[PDB]
Design a protein around this ligand. Structure first.
Ligand SMILES: [C]C1=C([C])[C]=C2C(=[C]1)N([C][C]([O])[C]([O])[C]([O])[C]OP([O])(=O)OP([O])(=O)O[C][C]1O[C](N3[C]=NC4=C3N=[C]N=C4[N])[C]([O])[C]1[O])C1=NC(=O)[N]C(=O)C1=N2[C]([C][C]=O)C1=C(O[C]C2=C(F)N=[C][C]=[C]2)C(F)=[C]C(F)=[C]1
Length: 645
């Protein structure tokens, strides 16, 4: 439905109030049910008005004007709802034409550290709320972990690049505002072994289904059997995976043993039976000779000896009858061995490709993920197909930058906060002699977790952060993932597939150049470096890593089909001092609760230091939309503090 759709698109239950809304509207929850239903219609319809046309600001007046009777009659309640939705960034977020021009007098000075998606989102909110906002950004560009390369006709994203489903996704609004060219991804993904041979369909499917089985089993171990702590250590996903593979191998070796035991027993029965038939032939040779050695006692001796001979012959025919039903049991046993091994060497390499794919998705070796909690955010996935940004994801943060006071090449080195306000100190990256001191009422830190983890610290906090916050920083995972961009003058791959796989030869190197994407109009290929390989590969020069790409591609399509690339680019997210990795993951011994701790502001009294970024939002970590939502959350929190809730 339409207004139900608006609630769903806002990640809200269309038919009940959230706890957050109960807090802000306690008179509604305690009042009659009828008024609660009126509240919900006001909320849903306001969201619908905004979502149907997010390119312009939705004002209170226009909300009142577009409500049908009787709802356009309860003006006070309508205003209460509009104000709440706006303050929480559920309407009038992103980039839109203002109806009310910006207030000329500001209220409060906010420094935003970082011009990534979270910092930009907060800046636009706070600027809309009438505050003085300045962004300090260490790079020479906006977007942070959204990073688009452009050269000639080539466009390619080195950081984020996928919009997951639009249903419920706030990026669906931003897409409409910015004109992102999104394109659905085709799901077919052929695999090629390290020799360039295609993985046959049956092997592709067999190994994939086993991957699904093993993984569901780790989840059963974790959430049914509570196998989460061992020898005082938290179990990792990698650890659980090794255990379930060990049990399959044990099972194969057992059925093999059971089968050899059946073989041996049948051989032993045949050995004995043949020995027994031997002795019955010997007995018949003896009677057949005493049958030729032969009166009334003789006429009766032949009758009796024929009776004896043909009875031993009937004994012998019944034993050769058992002899046949046994050596046919033997024949069919020798023809149906169970599997010699659980995974053939090739099967194992392909399976390591699926593990690598998972290390891509989580940006970290499987041996680091918390078994119990690595996918705690699964329940919040958006609906609809995933898409890629054909015109480059930088289109989003560049649009978010319009009108913001952004000082680029301004690297924060120290953050001071007291009960009287804050000071941020920064240097010019083109001249680290030049120093700047920014006083403000509040600091919003969107520094990546990797930068916060840096020892010795890149940015120093004064006073130092509390233990409950720093140990949360320490506990959380911060992964890595890299891309190689290959620009050619001709397309030699299958244009109708967006993905294809290179199966690495070893477990340790399973993440090396394992997945290739063709996602664009122009002849571009991205090859991913995941897992253990990601950090190690940063130490390889560009030309050499491209060469290894080219060798893989020449193996698959033929050496003469692969020309020299016209342009190449290589990400090194771990070595990037403004990233120090790609995005958080739930490390073994952490949990969603650490993401909640990260969002918590510090108070030295009133809060001064605030936190946003993908690492602060429990239900949507490690994503652009989660960063965005986190910026919206902190903008609401800061405005509630400094302008009143
Ligand atoms: C890195 C990365 C990559 C490579 C990729 C990706 C990613 C990443 N992701 C994530 C995102 O990006 C995040 O979440 C965001 O970004 C967040 O944000 P924030 O928070 O805001 O942060 P930043 O940006 O960084 O910002 C901050 C700032 O700050 C600054 N600084 C520093 N230092 C300093 C400063 N300033 C001053 N001072 C000082 N000292 C910096 O510089 C900055 O600026 C993502 N996401 C999403 O959503 N999407 C996507 O797409 C992504 N990605 C990925 C990963 C995983 O796997 C993903 C995916 O995949 C896709 C693909 C690719 F990528 N490639 C190829 C193919 C495909 C998917 F699918 C999904 C997802 F979810 C993810």
């Amino acid at each position: 439905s339409g207004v139900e759709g608006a609630a769903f698109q806002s990640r809200l239950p269309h038919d009940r109030m959230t706890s957050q809304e109960a807090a802000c509207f306690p008179d509604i929850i305690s009042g009659p049910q009828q008024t609660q239903k009126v509240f919900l219609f006001i909320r849903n319809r306001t969201l619908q008005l905004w979502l149907d046309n997010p390119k312009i600001q939705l004002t209170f007046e226009a909300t009142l004007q577009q409500l049908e009777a009787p709802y356009n009659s309860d003006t006070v309640l309508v205003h209460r709802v509009h104000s709440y939705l706006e303050r929480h960034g559920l309407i009038n977020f992103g980039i839109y034409k203002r109806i009310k021009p910006l207030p000329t007098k500001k209220t409060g000075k906010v420094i935003i550290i970082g011009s990534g998606v979270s910092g930009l989102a907060a800046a636009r909110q706070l600027q809309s709320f009438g505050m003085d906002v300045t962004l300090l950004e260490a790079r020479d560009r906006v977007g942070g972990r959204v990073a688009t390369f452009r050269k000639g006709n080539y466009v390619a994203d080195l950081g984020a690049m996928v919009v997951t489903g639009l249903g419920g996704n706030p990026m669906a609004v931003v897409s409409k505002q910015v004109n992102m060219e999104l394109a659905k991804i085709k799901q077919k993904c052929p695999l090629y072994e390290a020799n360039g041979q295609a993985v046959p369909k049956e092997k592709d499917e067999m190994v994939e289904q086993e991957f699904n089985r093993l993984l569901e089993a780790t989840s059963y171990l974790s959430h049914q059997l509570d196998f989460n702590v061992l020898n005082n250590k938290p179990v990792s996903l990698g650890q659980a995976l090794e255990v379930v593979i060990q049990l399959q191998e044990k099972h194969v070796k057992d059925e093999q043993i059971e089968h050899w035991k059946k073989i041996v027993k049948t051989q032993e029965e045949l050995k004995e039976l043949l020995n027994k038939m031997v002795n019955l032939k010997e007995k018949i040779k003896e009677l057949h000779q005493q049958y030729k050695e032969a009166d009334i006692t003789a006429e009766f001796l032949v009758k009796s000896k024929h009776r004896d001979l043909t009875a031993l012959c009937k004994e012998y025919d019944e034993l050769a009858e058992t002899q046949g039903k046994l050596e046919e049991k033997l024949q069919e046993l020798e023809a149906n061995p169970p599997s010699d091994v659980y995974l053939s060497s090739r099967d194992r390499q392909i399976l390591d490709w699926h593990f690598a794919n998972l290390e891509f998705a989580n940006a970290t070796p499987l041996s680091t993920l918390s078994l119990k909690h690595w996918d705690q955010d699964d329940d919040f996935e958006f609906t609809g197909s995933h898409l890629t940004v054909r015109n480059g994801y930088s289109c989003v943060p560049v649009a978010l930058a319009e009108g913001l006071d952004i000082k680029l090449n301004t690297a924060v080195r120290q953050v001071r906060y007291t009960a009287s306000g804050c000071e941020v100190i920064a240097v010019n990256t083109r001249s680290t002699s030049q120093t700047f001191i920014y006083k403000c009422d509040a600091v919003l830190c969107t520094l990546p977790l990797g930068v916060l983890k840096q020892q010795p610290p890149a940015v120093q906090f004064v006073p130092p952060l509390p233990e409950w916050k720093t140990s949360a920083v320490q506990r959380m995972g911060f992964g890595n993932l890299n891309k190689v961009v290959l620009c050619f003058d001709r397309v030699f791959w299958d244009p109708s597939v967006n993905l294809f796989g290179h199966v690495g030869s070893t477990t340790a190197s399973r993440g090396e150049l394992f997945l290739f994407w063709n996602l664009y109009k122009a002849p571009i290929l991205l090859a991913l470096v995941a897992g253990e390989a990601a950090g190690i590969m940063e130490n390889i020069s560009d030309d050499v890593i491209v060469g290894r790409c080219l060798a893989i591609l020449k193996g698959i399509f033929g050496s003469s089909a692969v020309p020299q690339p016209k342009e190449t680019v290589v990400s090194r997210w771990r070595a990037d001092p403004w990233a120090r990795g790609s995005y958080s993951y739930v490390a073994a011994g952490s949990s969603g609760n650490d993401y909640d701790l990260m969002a918590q502001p510090i108070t030295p009294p009133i809060p001064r230091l605030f936190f946003a970024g993908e690492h602060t939002i429990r239900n949507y970590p490690a994503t652009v939309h989660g960063a965005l939502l986190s910026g919206l959350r902190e903008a609401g929190r800061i405005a509630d503090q400094f302008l009143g809730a």
